[PDB]
Amino acid sequence: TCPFYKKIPGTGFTVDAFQYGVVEGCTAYFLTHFHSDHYAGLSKHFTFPVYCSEITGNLLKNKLHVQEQYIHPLPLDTECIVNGVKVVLLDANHCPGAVMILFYLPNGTVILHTGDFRADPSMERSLLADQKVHMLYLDTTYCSPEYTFPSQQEVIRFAINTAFEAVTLNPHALVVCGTYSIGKEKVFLAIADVLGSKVGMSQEKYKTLQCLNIPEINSLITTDMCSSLVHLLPMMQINFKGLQSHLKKCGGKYNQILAFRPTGWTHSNKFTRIADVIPQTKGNISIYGIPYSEHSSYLEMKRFVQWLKPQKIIPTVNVGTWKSRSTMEKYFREWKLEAGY
Numbered sequence: 267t268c269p270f271y272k273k274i275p276g277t278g279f280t281v282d283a284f285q286y287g288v289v290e291g292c293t294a295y296f297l298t299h300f301h302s303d304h305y306a307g308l309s310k311h312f313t314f315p316v317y318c319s320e321i322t323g324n325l326l327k328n329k330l331h332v333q334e335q336y337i338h339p340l341p342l343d344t345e346c347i348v349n350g351v352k353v354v355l356l357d358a359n360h361c362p363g364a365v366m367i368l369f370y371l372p373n374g375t376v377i378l379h380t381g382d383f384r385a386d387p388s389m390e391r392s393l394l395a396d397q398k399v400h401m402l403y404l405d406t407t408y409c410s411p412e413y414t415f416p417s418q419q420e421v422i423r424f425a426i427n428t429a430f431e432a433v434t435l436n437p438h439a440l441v442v443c444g445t446y447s448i449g450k451e452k453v454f455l456a457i458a459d460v461l462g463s464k465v466g467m468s469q470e471k472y473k474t475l476q477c478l479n480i481p482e483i484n485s486l487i488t489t490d491m492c493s494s495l496v497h498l499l500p501m502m503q504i505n506f507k508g509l510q511s512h513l514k515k516c517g518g519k520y521n522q523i524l525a526f527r528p529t530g531w532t533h534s535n536k537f538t539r540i541a542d543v544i545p546q547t548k549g550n551i552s553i554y555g556i557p558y559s560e561h562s563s564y565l566e567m568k569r570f571v572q573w574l575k576p577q578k579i580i581p582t583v584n585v586g587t588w589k590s591r592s593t594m595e596k597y598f599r600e601w602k603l604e605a606g607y
């Protein structure tokens with residue numbers, strides 16, 4: 267049965283609620299982005315209307331085989347009527363195709379559902395500036411002050427410099443990057459660009475990337491492993507065993523692997539600077555864990571919420587324990603008392 271935080275009061279709408287069967291009263295199912303916890307339950311046998319971005323729509327059709335007739339893509343930054351309710355989709359600065367959804371209820375209440383997001387100051391000059399928000403359905407993944415990590419720009423700078431240095435010293439070194447979902451494409455694309463290479467990957471991952479509307483993508487990726495010195499592999503293969511096995515497969519073309527594991531937050535963040543990160547090494551294999559986040563840091567989240575000044579906050583992440591829920595409620599009250607709303 268569908269939890270309260272996936273229901274939109276005063277509508278027949280749900281958000282990211284496809285694993286509960288037919289939801290009584292739901293006339294339109296919104297999907298914020300193509301991550302499996304959020305789409306869990308959709309398949310080619312779904313027959314209710316699905317509203318989403320163009321990109322999410324490409325992925326539902328090609329990867330999940332949902333039928334065309336039930337896919338409803340909406341452009342971003344555009345007032346749209348759905349089943350007689352005005353809605354707007356906003357870029358969530360998460361993975362490709364990810365949105366936030368603004369709902370303008372028939373009684374005058376305005377609701378923002380963030381989906382998954384990485385808050386940014388640029389959101390303060392979107393259509394959110396223009397009117398008041400009563401209720402906020404908030405991605406609270408990292409809602410605790412221990413959660414620090416650097417900017418995406420700093421992390422990409424570290425990766426580009428690390429890779430270019432290693433391959434310029436040893437032209438026979440291979441770079442490998444792990445992936446298990448869409449998102450974080452900048453990691454492998456920025457590294458391949460500095461090396462003057464395409465990125466090689468499986469047929470299944472190539473297909474996924476072809477759904478994402480990335481400009482000039484045909485110039486950046488390929489299924490021909492041999493021609494490429496940046497390879498993508500499943501995240502589960504990013505360990506000494508998996509990589510050894512992969513190097514065997516390249517037929518004596520390379521004698522060193524340098525590998526990247528983009529993680530979310532890891533406790534090494536509370537002591538160390540990005541500059542000072544060191545790999546795990548065994549032999550001719552080095553693995554770097556880099557903190558490339560597509561969710562808000564605690565400070566970014568706090569800034570956003572203090573700017574928006576919502577009347578009520580409903581968390582959508584970390585909701586399963588009493589201790590989590592109580593901790594999040596304490597920070598919302600500090601923020602409100604500090605800012606005066």
Ligand code: NI
Pocket residue numbers: 299301360382
């Ligand atoms: Ni996500």
